[PDB]
Amino acid sequence: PNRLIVDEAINEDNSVVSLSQPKMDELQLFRGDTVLLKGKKRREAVCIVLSDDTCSDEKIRMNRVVRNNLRVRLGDVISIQPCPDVKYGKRIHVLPIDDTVEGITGNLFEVYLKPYFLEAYRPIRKGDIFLVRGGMRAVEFKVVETDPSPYCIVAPDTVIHCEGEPIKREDEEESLNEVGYDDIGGCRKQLAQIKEMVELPLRHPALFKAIGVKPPRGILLYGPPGTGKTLIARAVANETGAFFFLINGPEIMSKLAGESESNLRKAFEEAEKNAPAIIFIDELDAIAPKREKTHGEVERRIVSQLLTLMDGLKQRAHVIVMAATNRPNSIDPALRRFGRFDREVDIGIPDATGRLEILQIHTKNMKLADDVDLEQVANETHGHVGADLAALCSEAALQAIRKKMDLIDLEDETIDAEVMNSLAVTMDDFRWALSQSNPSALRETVVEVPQVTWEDIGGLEDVKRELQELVQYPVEHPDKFLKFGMTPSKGVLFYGPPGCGKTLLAKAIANECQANFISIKGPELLTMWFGESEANVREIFDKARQAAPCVLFFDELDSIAKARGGNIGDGGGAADRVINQILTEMDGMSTKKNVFIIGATNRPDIIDPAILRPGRLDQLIYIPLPDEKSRVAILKANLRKSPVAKDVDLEFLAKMTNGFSGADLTEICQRACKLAIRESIESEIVPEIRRDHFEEAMRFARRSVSDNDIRKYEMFAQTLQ
Amino acid sequence: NGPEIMSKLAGESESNLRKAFEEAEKNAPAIIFIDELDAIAPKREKTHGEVERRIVSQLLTLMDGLKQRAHVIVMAATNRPNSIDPALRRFGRFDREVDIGIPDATGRLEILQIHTKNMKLADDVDLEQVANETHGHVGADLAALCSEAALQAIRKKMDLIDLEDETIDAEVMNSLAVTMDDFRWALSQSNPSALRETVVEVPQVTWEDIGGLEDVKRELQELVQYPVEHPDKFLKFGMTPSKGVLFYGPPGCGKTLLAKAIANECQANFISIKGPELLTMWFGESEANVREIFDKARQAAPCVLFFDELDSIAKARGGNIGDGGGAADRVINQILTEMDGMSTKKNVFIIGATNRPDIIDPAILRPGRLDQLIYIPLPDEKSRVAILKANLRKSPVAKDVDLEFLAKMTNGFSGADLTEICQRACKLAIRESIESEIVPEIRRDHFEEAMRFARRSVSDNDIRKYEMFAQTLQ
Amino acid sequence: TNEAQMAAAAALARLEQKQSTSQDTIRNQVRKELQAEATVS
């Protein structure tokens, strides 16, 4: 009884844990009460319990600081008990740990400990280790003396002493600046999926010895460089405690014949001796490239050696092998057969939210000025990966250090704590670093859950509802579909003029469903055909299966028909190699994988009719240019983020822009916004957009769809009845 | 296994392979199993190195040495029987072979039951639902599925009770049941390894699923059953049984269901070849795959090999225009060849389907090939009603629904179009039922509304061409 | 008890202050004006 599973916390605070209410009622404690935690080897901690809507009933959520003091790891279980007799302390003695007091001098108490405890009212226990962040350094301290014992709350009126040399870290505790899960920003879903696969085999090996189940013995990670593939592999080993062995392709390949095989075997033999252990092989495609793609005997031999060592993992107890590559299909397929590397996780590229999280992670210690806006940076850093965002944080820190501190300090390794704490990084330093950095992954496609909602789309009220019926109803009301023998559609095709919101329709339903949006463009379908790489069709559909829930959007479906001539071409049909592979993958995809396929085209008259057969994109939705009420709605939607003067007549503008698409109405709003901003900036050398700004914008905006194109689209839609 | 031998240096791989045979003799009777055979003895054209050629020759001589190594049998496993050195299949050696393939729905259910023998299942667990849903899975995937379903249940309860020790109390496992939500969850997490493989099985299509065409059903029984039910009567009367039939007529009239239904009644393995597959072979100039398809049919005998959309290639070449040539192409020529060499007593029946007989090489209709012709017109008045009744056999239908009235209106509709009407009415009933909670049956209003959106797929210009062709055939 | 509730109030204030649009248009317009003045001189 009163035993809870240790897991990660959302609240980063050094004295806070979170429980689900049913456990707070059974433990007879209230929100804000102090409790004691009992871990391993007679180690205890004191904390405050809060609650949220994310902790499960069986779990207790805590940060690394609490787990380190209890000598427990994620997946363990501890005891919890209330202690309502906790009172305030009188005098405490806190000293830093030498592991973090390097390159720094000055009054660490006044810089770190005093801000940390002042109005903080934190519960402490003798021997507690806690981390205080600031001045671009993270310093951890130990409680070595308390007048009350073993625990007390430190009030602002207590005496805090700090006299003596920094304390050497003990072997029973780990440094709080070591890499853990809280250092990983984006790809949180992937990290959770991996944790489930590896944490239990390593944390509780007894259960797999006794229970008739096979553990994963190999996980392949893939994505561009700098996304965190090697960060995850190390963070997992650090969190679980397994010995981490590092291997990389090019180093093993740099060895002579016989040396490369011996070195690879040694790593596996050492992992068994040090089990539980994790073997991470970086650049897997370099150590084990496809055999059919090389000529060398040594390269074919090292693949055979790795294949046998992977099979030997059925005998090497508690050893998991992980690997990283840039492309999941650039390695010899034998490694991915049952057993061996039977699991894989797509890391990809962080999205806008993950990029902000990474910037926040790499600023934990940084003092930021009020003008610093990392969300704006995350939105501007398109194509950047964690390696690039970390560079931006460090470069911005250096610029602030050179502007101020380099005119104060000597060219030495030791700086006063007060000087470091006095240094804050401004937005100009982040903008400078942004101009110096260059995205390492700008060409690769990025898949993310879109931020487009239904309120972002003007008009098309019936289409928005129709997509909800097509995408949500099959899983929200499955008993009605079964009752009436209905087969849910697997997708819908959109056709009509460009610039009417087709991209928002697919994103908006993905947003409400919290699903990833995968955007495939014509140039990708054209590359597959011309480059004789039709196998990339499977990569696209597999990305959807692995990214599920997701919406798989195939834009420019006409690109294949156009490649065959489009308007003229030969005497045959639109059938070709790429579309046949696409249709095959569609037929083999189940709706129970939470993947919905949406297509679009601006030339529906040349789409291979096969795509419209039952089981494919059988439903057709026409998206014409917005009507009178929709054009006004579009203008109003774009202006929701800015004050609009009372002299602006949006209905008059919409009546004039009769042939304009939604994309063209957006340009008018954005241009009028820019014009209002231009005036605002000059007034400081205004609070709202004036009629003059919209009328001026009207002089430059033009319709993107000609009158002849409108008739072509309307006649086609009419032909379909 | 391949990698174990290939990882060894020149001289070590040959010695180790020889020792394996020596040990089998010393311990005879013995069985040697060579996994990933194609890794040790790949087709000769796939390797040119001196070391790789020598180790292959060593295997060939050791296989021949089995004449002296009494009571030793060597088995080997490969992914494809044609990816290995053909010399291995010479009389003796590896002359015998067995196609393991993949399990069907029945086999998958048996596999799930086997890998759950030790598992405690909740009352809601239904492994038949799983076996039917696990399309494209192999036994190794179903075993992984069972493990993942158990692991989810284990994490929920085993960690909750905090059973942290070296041994598990038997009572804890005794009360730990895996629910249907744990299997369905695992199904969402798993991913079949054989999703793109060819699936060959006895179809579940019955004659009760096909409306109308009573005379075609009887004709297929004569063409497929009689040659093997009464082989002595065919000899007595000097009758040569047909080896196949070509179906023609408007699309969407059941051509595929007819081939499946007779395969089901006869419990024969049904092989489905579709237009995209015929086009893939044509586009890639890989018509040799046709011989592999017919070879699979022979291995699967008794079987029914159905070639749908035979006109897909002729249409891809232009169909009505194209070039000035004939209906012959790389793929159909190999199909014609394999039928000509097919043995009457191999219990292989070939069925084709086209929508444009005027562009199919007439040679396909010669004796020994698809010599029989069956016309499948648009369903008549009584058949369209039967089709609607069959399509609605899985849903509640209100008594006010007049299926004869609907069939009378849908005079130009195919069976495929009647299904669209049924599904539209079902969707409307679903939307109405869901709204009532924010109904128990499909109402006439739902079918009447569907009638305003459904259209006939085959126009009168095509029906007249179909009828005139059928008339030309007398 | 009461000392624990004061500790909880302090922890809640720290977490909520740290964890808890026309401004991005204003920032982008000021940045564009500063770049235009830097190019005219």
Ligand SMILES: Nc1ncnc2c1ncn2[C@@H]1O[C@H](COP(=O)(O)OP(=O)(O)O)[C@@H](O)[C@H]1O
């Ligand atoms: N997903 C991520 N989240 C947080 N930080 C990341 C992420 N990906 C990379 N980084 C950071 O970028 C750097 C990557 O360097 P390294 O660990 O050598 O990885 P790589 O394999 O890309 O070379 C580290 O400073 C790491 O903290």
Ligand SMILES: Nc1ncnc2c1ncn2[C@@H]1O[C@H](COP(=O)(O)OP(=O)(O)O)[C@@H](O)[C@H]1O
């Ligand atoms: N109906 C609409 N409501 C609001 N904005 C729209 C609408 N249609 C288009 N837009 C704007 O036009 C831009 C282009 O839309 P998109 O669908 O990508 O056009 P395309 O046909 O080029 O893909 C979008 O960023 C969106 O802001």
Ligand SMILES: Nc1ncnc2c1ncn2[C@@H]1O[C@H](COP(=O)(O)OP(=O)(O)O)[C@@H](O)[C@H]1O
């Ligand atoms: N006679 C029939 N009875 C019942 N359903 C039919 C009939 N004819 C066609 N259908 C419906 O039409 C659909 C298409 O049939 P199929 O034979 O696969 O067409 P094709 O062979 O031209 O591709 C089937 O799913 C079936 O439900």
